[PDB]
Amino acid sequence: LEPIDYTTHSREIDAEYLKIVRGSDPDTTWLIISPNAKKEYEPESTGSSFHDFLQLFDETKVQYGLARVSPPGSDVEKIIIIGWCPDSAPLKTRASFAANFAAVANNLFKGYHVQVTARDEDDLDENELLMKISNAAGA
C-alpha cells in the first residue's frame, strides 16, 4: 500500500511531540501533522487551546493530531491522538489509513491515553472527547 512518511521531518515532528507529551511549554499543548506536496508528513499547526485543535483539521487530507489535555474535574493531564481520515482525502491514502494510524500510534506519538478515529467535525465534539479522556486508562 502507501506507507506513511514521518521520518523525513522527524526533527520538526519529535520537537513538538516531546514538548506536548511532557507539558514543558503551555503555549504548545497540541500538534497536527499533515502531508506536504511530496507526501511527507510534517508539523502543520500547533496551539495551546484544545478547542482550537479540534477545529484545525483539513477535510481534504489524512492527518494526525496529538494533544495534551486535562478535562475539567481534575488536574491530571492526558494524551489523546486523533487519526483524521476525511472522505475527501485521496483514495489511496484513505485505504492506507488503518495501517498508517497504527504506525503513528506505535512508533511516533507513543504514550497516548486515548485514540480516536475522526472523519468530520461531528467526530471531534469537545465534550465527548473530554469525557473519553477522563475515563481513560494508563498510557
Side-chain angles (χ1 to χ4, degrees):
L1 28 60
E2 207 166 68
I4 183 182
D5 165 34
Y6 52 58
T7 53
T8 291
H9 298 294
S10 57
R11 216 74 55 187
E12 303 76 287
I13 293 182
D14 298 331
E16 304 306 331
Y17 167 70
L18 284 177
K19 282 185 188 177
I20 297 178
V21 296
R22 292 176 172 170
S24 59
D25 182 5
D27 290 319
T28 307
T29 63
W30 62 259
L31 155 73
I32 289 183
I33 62 174
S34 188
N36 60 35
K38 304 182 175 185
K39 295 178 188 173
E40 311 177 306
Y41 276 78
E42 59 188 5
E44 178 166 273
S45 53
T46 61
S48 57
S49 164
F50 182 61
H51 180 261
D52 274 10
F53 174 56
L54 301 174
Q55 299 184 281
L56 305 228
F57 290 92
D58 198 317
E59 59 178 57
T60 63
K61 305 173 188 181
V62 169
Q63 307 171 306
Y64 305 84
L66 171 75
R68 182 166 198 262
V69 199
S70 174
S74 79
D75 282 353
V76 72
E77 295 278 349
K78 293 177 182 169
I79 289 51
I80 176 172
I81 58 169
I82 290 174
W84 173 262
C85 187
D87 295 341
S88 299
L91 183 69
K92 297 180 183 177
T93 63
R94 281 186 287 122
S96 302
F97 174 70
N100 290 325
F101 189 19
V104 172
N106 309 320
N107 317 305
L108 187 64
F109 294 164
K110 297 179 69 58
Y112 59 86
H113 297 89
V114 182
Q115 179 181 186
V116 172
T117 289
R119 285 175 44 243
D120 62 67
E121 285 86 304
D122 283 359
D123 297 327
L124 302 171
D125 171 64
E126 181 163 24
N127 287 309
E128 150 81 312
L129 295 176
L130 291 179
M131 181 188 87
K132 292 191 178 196
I133 287 175
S134 178
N135 292 322

